Design an enzyme around this catalytic site. Structure first.
Site, PDB file in Angstrom:
ATOM      1  N   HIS A   1      -2.029  -2.022   7.092  1.00  0.00           N
ATOM      2  CA  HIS A   1      -2.767  -2.365   8.304  1.00  0.00           C
ATOM      3  C   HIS A   1      -3.196  -3.820   8.226  1.00  0.00           C
ATOM      4  CE1 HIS A   1      -6.612  -2.328   6.171  1.00  0.00           C
ATOM      5  NE2 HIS A   1      -6.314  -1.138   5.688  1.00  0.00           N
TER       6      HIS A   1
ATOM      7  N   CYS B   1      -5.974   0.171   0.454  1.00  0.00           N
ATOM      8  CA  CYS B   1      -4.878  -0.021   1.393  1.00  0.00           C
ATOM      9  C   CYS B   1      -4.021  -1.244   1.054  1.00  0.00           C
ATOM     10  CB  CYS B   1      -5.432  -0.144   2.813  1.00  0.00           C
ATOM     11  SG  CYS B   1      -6.633   1.121   3.333  1.00  0.00           S
TER      12      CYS B   1
END
Length: 347
Positions: free
Chosen positions: A285, A291
């Site tokens: 993202h 992440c």
């Protein structure tokens, strides 16, 4: 000086199942035959009056049913069969199918017609535990084009129920078509439970796309048949503590969000261009952790390219993807471990 001959035989009707039987399986063989004669009319109705289809096998000695039956239903025969002498004798009879203790429903996670990435599992989730997983798995056939080696494996039951996963051993070849047949109607799942419904699923594997994610590299590469189509600077979890380590192993893309509002174990955030690579909160993202973070315009361009089932190969990390991270962890285990989660022997 007259006749003194003993008369020709009476027709002999043999009913399978037999008259008055209960606990008859709705996909059992249902028939009626006559010897010493041939049928003139046969029909089977349920308690409500619906005819159940069937055809006579040749030289009308047998009539057989050609569609499955319902549960907890009583079926009656009506008809006649004529003997040698010419007189017709009635074809009358009853039986009743099983009522299961419960009917265990199931469902696939992909829709018929879906195009998925080269690493998509087939996920069948039930809504009860399952006592005889081997009986159910033996009702599963997977047929691939081209043909590809794979296996069925049961994961620990979720709160909703038991669940079984089909994985190819290597990635699907791009374009492969997949047909899955689950013959679970009238199948005993053990402990008095029965399948709710036969299920079938057709889908296709899409274009080959692999994400190469070496954590020590601060890049991600996106590689198709066109070669490296994306080589982005990125950054991964700082790996201070374990919560902020990007898991090692082959991930599967599942969901993706143009614009998203989440709150679940990490802190809580709201983001943009998220591609979910684990149910543990890992995404590719934009950041402007866990992440993989890209610039917003690189997160967007990847986001658009991605598909359910795409593999993300993360390398150079010190904690390997696991059941503890949630779905999809099917590619984080070797093949010998996958064939060992079958309820059947390991050919």
């Amino acid at each position: 000086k007259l006749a003194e001959k003993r008369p020709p035989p009476a027709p002999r009707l043999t009913f399978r199942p037999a008259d008055s039987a209960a606990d008859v399986v709705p996909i059992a063989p249902i028939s009626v035959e006559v010897g010493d004669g041939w049928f003139q009319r046969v029909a089977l109705t349920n308690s409500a009056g619906k005819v159940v289809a069937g055809a006579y096998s040749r030289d009308r000695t047998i009539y057989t049913i050609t569609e499955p039956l319902g549960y907890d239903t009583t079926y009656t025969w009506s008809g006649s069969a004529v003997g040698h002498d010419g007189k017709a004798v009635p074809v009358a009879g009853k039986f009743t199918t099983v009522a299961p203790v419960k009917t265990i429903n199931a469902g696939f996670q992909l829709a018929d017609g879906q195009t998925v990435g080269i690493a998509a599992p087939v996920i069948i989730q039930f809504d009860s535990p399952i006592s005889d997983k081997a009986a159910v798995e033996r009702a599963l056939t997977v047929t691939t084009d081209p043909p590809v080696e794979g296996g069925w494996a049961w994961l620990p039951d979720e709160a909703q129920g038991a669940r079984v996963h089909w994985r190819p051993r290597e990635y699907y070849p791009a374009g492969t078509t997949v047909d899955v047949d689950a013959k679970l109607y009238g199948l005993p799942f053990g402990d008095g439970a029965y399948g709710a419904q036969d299920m079938s699923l057709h889908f296709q594997i899409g274009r080959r796309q692999v994400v190469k994610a070496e954590v020590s590299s601060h890049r991600i590469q996106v590689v198709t048949d066109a070669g490296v189509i994306m080589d982005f600077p990125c950054s991964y979890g700082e790996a201070d503590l374990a919560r902020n380590v990007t898991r090692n192993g082959i991930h599967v893309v599942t969901e993706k969000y143009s614009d998203f509002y989440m709150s679940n174990p990490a802190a809580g955030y709201s983001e943009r261009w998220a591609v979910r690579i684990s149910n543990n909160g890992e995404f590719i993202h934009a950041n402007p952790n866990g992440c993989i973070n890209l610039s917003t315009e690189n997160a967007e361009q990847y986001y658009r390219s991605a598909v359910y089932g795409d593999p993300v190969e993360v390398t150079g990390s010190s904690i390997q993807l696991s059941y503890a991270d949630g779905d999809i962890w099917d590619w984080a285990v070797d093949w010998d471990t996958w064939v060992s989660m079958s309820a059947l022997p390991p050919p």
